[model samples]
Target: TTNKPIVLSTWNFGLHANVEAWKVLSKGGKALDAVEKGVRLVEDDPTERSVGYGGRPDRDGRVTLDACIMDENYNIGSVACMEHIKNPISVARAVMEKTPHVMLVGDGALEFALSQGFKKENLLTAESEKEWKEWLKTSQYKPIVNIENHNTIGMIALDAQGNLSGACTTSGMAYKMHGRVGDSPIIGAGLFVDNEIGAATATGHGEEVIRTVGTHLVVELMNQGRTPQQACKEAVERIVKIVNRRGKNLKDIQVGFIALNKKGEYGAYCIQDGFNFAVHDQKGNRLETPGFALK
Candidate 1:
């Protein structure tokens, strides 16, 4: 069996995120706190363009953010299309603990965060402004999948106490339509946690993942006796089936899932090459690639 206190996160950048989270898990901290602490590392980074402070802007040149946090007891908080908040994940946690609602969106989310003592600041950096300005010349809205954008950072951890929790955060799609909200802040689509069973989180194309309620499906499969790997694989296959039925070009989209079961076993799967996740446990932190559905 795998070691306890294991943490997993989406993308290579998640390696550093997992390291910070390891500091928590190694000390016997709560998995809910570990996942939040881990994702905050990426959120506070100005160099990371797909999440938090330095995230690329939408079509209107506004840097909006989306985030969600889920705990073992099924408490969840989410914020979508929020602007000027540095740590949306923390805001999400506040929404979960401080408020009685499951989600807050747009201006209401910002209002709630500000009321909770979250500082207001310009999230768009000079570098992102320059990139947005350059794109305005052509004004084409095309995301190159896993190439130019790493998208959301979805993290799940099993603490020493065997409790599971997860967090997913993103700046939404780079250069997306104004007011667009991706899967990052949506429960079941981007992140899900079932302490009695397991937890799962997803990354990549939000629309595709949203349609299938991807992460929740993974945990349910595991609950039904599928191994973590088998569950992840099936999730990817389900995405493939939907994409094929819609006559969509499989080469144009990328979606990935990473899962951890109650036994501490973990698995990952993606729709195309270039998707990778980071894992940290008693062994060490490392980047791993899951089997892909497409060649």
Candidate 2:
């Protein structure tokens, strides 16, 4: 393994964004810019149903978007439960650039986006409408709590400049309560950054991920001298313990984490039956794998 203190990883939702970001960084882009661009890719893609627009709708048939961005400097920003906003990631970047705070949520986040001159339009599309209608007919009003299917797009990166960054974007939980937002838009919960250390991003059950601040905990474990694989596995184990303590079945609840150590080595783990992730090396070779079997 190459002992370089710069690495990146992310979950399934942001695959295109992740690839593009990796390409940029591999071409000498700044880590922060790469992360921002990666997040923006998902935010800009209307067809990424579970990510930006056209996602699975809430009970009320509305699509709300959430996203977060973090820089190696440890500066973090996020927006949650934003309706009619096309680019949640841009709003997140604005939060990092224009605000003194780390997070903005709900209508407040929408207002901030509008004040920043982001265009307003319907966030829900026909695809999401169909999905909601279908779910309503079959699942009735049961909450959409299928954890393995919750694939929030995320990315972690180390640029040629040696700075580390991470980003996460999602349309919130499927069939979530109207206006319900989760950890995908939260800094420490969904995405975490520490320039002195490394970066991590997460997907799967937001409830469990939020309870443990999943991504942040992984990075912390790495900081405590755990290898990337060990940190990720330990983090999931902690969530498992929490579920056991609460008498919740681990059957359907799953969590996934991807991390890159300061040494440029990458690792990932998931409680689900499967997960998709990829890595591009300095030589332009790419390796993609499924995590379920490894687990």
Candidate 3:
């Protein structure tokens, strides 16, 4: 409830998301509005190949999007396997504000989106389509390093009134299985907000994230009195530990968590190196390459 408002997002893409949300937090708007408005920018950017518009397609070469938004009141709404929608984040907002349900999926979600008047467009771009065509030859199932600079835009913002809200949006893994839905659209998997505790979000391999219910675990840690860094670190470390049990090091995987406490304290942690996050507060905005939970 302090006048200190803070905003944060995952990866270097967060650098811009933070700026957009700042416009609202600095002007005394609600955190809910800030996050919804901010993430929509990334959702709208046709060149950001890992997000809504220009996102890469599934193995079948069809683009699917997933998004979730949560307010301090615990009101959350999500949509998954959404194809042809221009802005899935905005659709997620409508699900939260206009519906009685917490989530909508597949064609039902698509129908809902169209009924809401969201225009449809082919989400696959020529660049990504060409890559998919090239990838078709090998049919490789391995993931790319950094996953083409994965930045799912999981963001949390605190408004001047001391309320919290969060959003997570993504097109998910490149050339993933058809109908695959990632952590971003699943509340508490990709994003979670607890007005009395804090908020947390994740990006990277969605399977690892879904297994941990990553962001909810971080918020629970904060509820148990851990700092934002401690919570985020522990949550990601769980993923690393689980993977290491399979006899593989974290070098081949990436999962990251970003957190913001009710006090404006924020932190980021990853399973391995080459991950970064952004922070913005009364002072200003800066992107940081964060430390990892494991070596």
Candidate 4:
């Protein structure tokens, strides 16, 4: 309920990301600027194994990226399975502001990015290259639940102006099928922002998030008067029901959501205990845990 700005992001690594965003929020900058600036730090980091430049390659040995950005005005843009672009989130923003389309993908996205003045670069690192080669022995391709390698950096911010914006970016599941696109680049699934209601962003299993249109559902629940925590908890519950009905074991699946209401109240929930998020506001940056469906 404070007028001061606030930012939230998935995973422990979000601590640093939140700090980067706070630099903007603290200065009364736009939420859109804060969220994008925040995630770009993670995207540019070479050590982060699941996003942007240094991310692991797909099964076909190419590093593809997915990202989406949404402003309080409902303007959203995305890129999926894009190769050679270093900052897909920026490209997503370009798509939102510069094009009539909501999304661009693969070679088309790459072409648009180049046309937009983005420089092409090799995203694979020596470490990731070595790891991909090591993984080639078995070629086993299963997403490890709650593992660092699969965590997407989904971020939301409530700026000093009371506007909300969010961004979700990831390299997608390591060694995934060539050309496979996840929810990270899809609006409503990976991230959603409703200036009047709230903002929600998701991490973990993109498939489950996509099936439920998870983030949008959370914002609607908030619009229906659910608190941020209540909305996120219900969203996680809905995902659980779908998993159960499909005869899937909850132990093998993980999904998490973080929500921030127009009042600046924030909350999070996850399918498993390991999921957490970072919140930065006047209270300072700290990791917060969500109500979990399983131990």
Candidate 5:
């Protein structure tokens, strides 16, 4: 459409979602619309169990959600620790468009959604509940894997008008503290977009990404004339340096970044293996591109 690239996240989790979002651009939909709808596809999927309605629960066994959206205009909205409201990205967009607030959390967020006519219902599913119950048996606080990457979705899109937008949504870390919020709803942490420049998004380890100001750093580097790949590498490397400086040297953690330059070129990097993302253009479906990893 705009000759810009459309990149979706987590190759395993986002390929079909990429196709879904691509249809929006093909039909002249705005980047925000496509990005929102793209991540929504994953939200509606029950099998994932890490996002949307059935996302893994907190230590108390309650499923909470966080989500955010940013348009090419730099307008943004977010919700954190929001419960029972389906389609958090929709509410995030509403916050951007309807209210003066940049973010709304907890009961405040739920009330705002309800006032806007969003429905409230139980978000937990039996399958996920059973899994949580079993997890309680072990009571393992250690993350199960690359939970941020495996559990969340980060999405970006560009339209024929050359405007870029991004979206992020997640249930957050499994067995997390009840009020714990991850990078997903934090702008410049989990996701960032500058229509005048480019866009980037992150998954894997939200805390690590947040500390690094991960996505914003990538976009800033691209703004500095770095290729998307080079920018992503620098961002990942910076996180490692920050970890060492903080005396953590946390190699067991995983953090992933995905980026798209203004010209439509894209790249991804991560702090662990099993990281990949999907890219689709009119030419063809580039099913899965591996991301650079710590090892």
Candidate 6:
């Protein structure tokens, strides 16, 4: 058996067709290209209903996309609450290569994307339209113990040349106000990369993920010599503690994180009842775990 650690990572591939992108990259593709292609796969799929064009709509029945990309060099870029724009990940890449800043949010982000030649239209898709209409007439808002599961597609890829990159894309929280943005478009919170250490991406309650900057924190811990599993656990435990100290019950909010260390070993943990993720190895073999039930 080879002593070299294998590169393993996890991403919420269900919300988008991002798994296809990762597959392509695993066979030898650029980190930036992999990130762009992975996220664009979601943007191009209309049936996902939780990401990109046809994703779940907000309170006003509009679909907004949020995405971020970070390179092995730690250069990060993001776009949030972008409406009517297809390929949110492309805009994120442009922000990384074309601008001096790492993030752009809300209407301002949309304006910037449009100026870069992105087409604008009503982002709500047919599926989201129906979902919104059903919720509007029903008194389903704030039902007892309502579970708000926000699925964000993210990727941490290692190229054949050994470079690393992290990317994330999402539709934000369901039933959120129109134009409500979330952590998916935040660099360190939603995605992080460091070639010398590892990379991480997150999906769950955006509020909780953003507050903790979970992805980057986990990467930092790995840099400090912690294993991917240990880093993820401690980072999540910190968030759990914060919630407990605030007198909020842990069952009320959920958080999840996935990581791949420099050695390519992968790890994941979640505070929620379930989460779905996939991993691809150098041999082109892919493995998927549908939920965190095993943990």
The regions of model 5 sitting more than 4 angstroms off are: 147-149
Distance from true location, Cα of 34 in model 6, Å: 1.0
Q: Which residue pairs of candidate 5 clash?
A: 2-160, 149-204
Error of 1 at 90 (Å): 0.3
Q: Which RMSD values do the candidates have, in order?
A: 0.9, 2.6, 1.4, 0.9, 1.8, 3.3
TM-score of each predicted structure versus truth: 0.98, 0.90, 0.96, 0.98, 0.95, 0.87
Candidate 6: stretches off by over 4 Å: 1-19, 138-149, 288-295
**Which candidate would rank higher by lDDT, 4 or 6?**
4
Model 1, span 3-83: residue lDDT tens: 699999999998999999999999999998999999999999999999999999998899999999999999999999999
On residues 1-295, what C-alpha lDDT tens digit does candidate 3 reach at each position? 4536889888787889888999998999999989987888898898888889999889999999999999999999999999999788888989988999989998999999999999989888889899999999999977653735656788898888888999999998888899998899998899999999899989998988898899999999999999899898888878878887878767777888999888888888888788888888988999887778655
TM-score of 2: 0.90
C-alpha RMSD of candidate 1: 0.9
Per residue, candidate 6 scores C-alpha lDDT tens digits across 142-236 of 41111234556777767667777877887777778777777788878888888899888877777777889888899999999888777877788
RMSD of 5: 1.8
Error of 5 at 277 (Å): 0.1
lDDT of 2 by residue, 230-277 (tens): 888888888878888999878767677888876676788777655656
Q: Write the per-residue lDDT of candidate 4 for residues 1-295, one digit (tens) a residue.
A: 4645999999999999999999999999999999999999999998988999899999988999999999999999999999998899999999999999999999999999999999999999999999999999999888885845487799999999999999999999899999988889999999999999999999988989999999999999999999999999999999999999999999989999999999899899999998889999897899888889976
In candidate 3, how many clashes are counted?
0
Candidate achieving higher lDDT, 1 or 3: 1
Query: Which of candidates 1 and 2 reaches a greater TM-score?
Result: 1
Ranking the candidates on lDDT from highest down gives 1, 4, 3, 5, 2, 6
Provide the lDDT at 218 for model 1.
97
Q: Tell me the lDDT of model 6 at 34.
A: 70
